[PDB]
Structure formats: C-alpha cells, structure tokens
Amino acid sequence: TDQQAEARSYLSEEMIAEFKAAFDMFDADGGGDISVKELGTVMRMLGQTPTKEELDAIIEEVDEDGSGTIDFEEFLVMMVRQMKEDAKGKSEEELAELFRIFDRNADGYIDAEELAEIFRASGEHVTDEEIESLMKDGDKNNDGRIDFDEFLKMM
Numbered sequence: 001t002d003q004q005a006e007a008r009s010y011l012s013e014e015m016i017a018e019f020k021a022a023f024d025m026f027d028a029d030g031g032g033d034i035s036v037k038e039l040g041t042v043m044r045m046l047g048q049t050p051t052k053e054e055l056d057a058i059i060e061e062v063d064e065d066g067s068g069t070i071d072f073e074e075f076l077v078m079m080v081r082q083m084k085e086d087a088k089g090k091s092e093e094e095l096a097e098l099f100r101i102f103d104r105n106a107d108g109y110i111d112a113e114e115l116a117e118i119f120r121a122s123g124e125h126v127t128d129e130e131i132e133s134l135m136k137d138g139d140k141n142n143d144g145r146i147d148f149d150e151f152l153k154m155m
C-alpha cells in the first residue's frame with residue numbers, strides 16, 4: 001500500500017535486513033506472516049504479558065489487507081511508527097527537563113537571560129541580539145514571555 005511504501009523509503013537497506021531477521025524469528029513456521037499464536041509466544045518469551053485482546057489490537061493496527069496476521073511490509077510499518085513515536089517522546093521529555101532546569105527562578109517562563117544561558121551551557125556562541133530576536137520570534141502570543149509550548153515549538 002501507499003503507507004507501506006512510505007515506511008520502507010524511510011529505512012536504509014541495512015535496517016530492513018535487520019528487521020527481516022527479527023521477522024523471521026517471530027514467524028516460527030516460516031509461513032510468511034505472524035499469527036496471534038506466534039506473536040503472543042515471542043512476546044511472552046521477552047517477559048511481556050499481553051491479553052488476547054491486546055494481541056488483536058496490535059495486529060489490527062497495521063493489518064491493511066484484513067488477514068488477521070502481520071506480513072513483512074506491515075511489520076515494517078509497525079517498526080517506523082514505533083521509531084518515530086520513540087523519537088518524538090524522547091525530545092519532548094528532554095526539552096521538558098531543559099525548561100525545568102534553566103527556568104532558574106521557577107516562575108514558569110523563560111526570559112532572555114535564561115534563554116542566553118541555555119545556549120551558552122549547550123556550547124553554542126550566540127549574540128545578545130540573536131537572543132532577543134529568538135525571544136521575539138518565539139513569543140507567539142506577545143506577552144513578552146516564553147512559556148513551555150512556545151519553548152517546545154521554538155526548539
């Protein structure tokens with residue numbers, strides 16, 4: 001499908017070959033797709049405890065031809081979804097802790113001094129004017145402050 005072709009174009013040949021090796025390990029009978037039986041089996045062998053309904057939910061999430069099983073191109077979609085979700089999570093979680101730390105007076109906002117120290121502590125030389133412009137551009141609602149959602153969006 002459309003979506004399977006996008007997922008593949010996102011991955012290197014090298015990643016795809018590593019995913020095919022894992023897929024071949026789920027596909028216990030070599031038949032070409034992962035069943036409910038097979039998915040639960042390796043999930044339980046990796047210390048997970050899914051319910052049958054959770055096994056069904058996972059399959060249906062990527063099950064584009066309605067077979068009730070996962071073929072390799074569907075597997076690759078499950079993998080790209082997981083990576084992008086990981087990545088997105090890691091970034092927000094890190095920027096949340098950066099905002100926390102450099103909001104040194106704990107008023108809930110980042111001002112131009114605090115913003116200038118984020119950049120210096122990061123090892124990037126920035127000018128005062130650079131900082132004040134980022135402040136301006138970043139201040140979307142024009143209250144003169146940078147709140148968290150403006151911070152996120154700015155970085």
Ligand SMILES: [Ca+2]
Nearest residue numbers: 027031033034
């Ligand atoms: Ca199989």
Ligand SMILES: [Ca+2]
Nearest residue numbers: 048049050051
């Ligand atoms: Ca459980």
Ligand SMILES: [Ca+2]
Nearest residue numbers: 056057060068
């Ligand atoms: Ca079902």
Ligand SMILES: [Ca+2]
Nearest residue numbers: 056057060061
């Ligand atoms: Ca259903």
Ligand SMILES: [Ca+2]
Nearest residue numbers: 063067069070
């Ligand atoms: Ca399928």
Ligand SMILES: [Ca+2]
Nearest residue numbers: 103107109110
């Ligand atoms: Ca502050």
Ligand SMILES: [Ca+2]
Nearest residue numbers: 139141143145
């Ligand atoms: Ca603002």
